[PDB]
Design a binder for this molecule. Sequence first.
Ligand code: A1BQV
Ligand code: ZN
Length: 139
Amino acid sequence: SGAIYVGNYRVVNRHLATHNDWANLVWEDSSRDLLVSSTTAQGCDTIARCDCQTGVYYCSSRRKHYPVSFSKPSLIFVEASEYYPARYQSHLMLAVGHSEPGDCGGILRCQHGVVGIVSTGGNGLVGFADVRDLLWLDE
Ligand SMILES: NC(=O)[C@H]1CCC(=O)N(Cc2cccc3cc[nH]c23)C1
Ligand SMILES: [Zn+2]
C-alpha cells in the first residue's frame, strides 16, 4: 500500500485505486500502472525533478528502507498478474532488492525528493513507477 501527496493530487498504483480515486479521476495510465486523483486537503510531498539513479525505497514486507541503484525509466516486459495480463509496462525503473505484491505503493526517494512508487517485483528485483516526468503535479 501507499500514495504520494503533492498539492491537490493523490498518486497511487492504478491497480490499487479506490472508488473515491475513480470518482475524482484526474489522470490514469494502465501501461504505467499509475492513477492520479484529486484531494480537498493540501499535500506536502516534494517530487524530484532529476535523472538520479540512486535512492532509498520503503519495503513494508520487511519494515525497512533500503538504499538502491536503479535503471532509467523504460519499457520492461512484466509477467501476468490478477490485475493485468502479461504486457510491457512503460516508465519502469528496476533495482536489485526485495519486493512482494503488497509492497506496491512504497515510495522511492532521492536527495531531490520522490522519484516514484513500487509497482513490480520477483526474482530478487523491484520495479518502480516513475513520477518525475509528470511536471503538472506542481501546477
Ligand atoms: N505493475 C504490475 O503489473 C503489478 C500488478 C499487480 C502485482 O501484484 N504485480 C506483481 C508484483 C508486484 C510487486 C512485487 C512483486 C513480487 C512478486 N510479484 C510482484 C505487478
Ligand atoms: Zn534526484
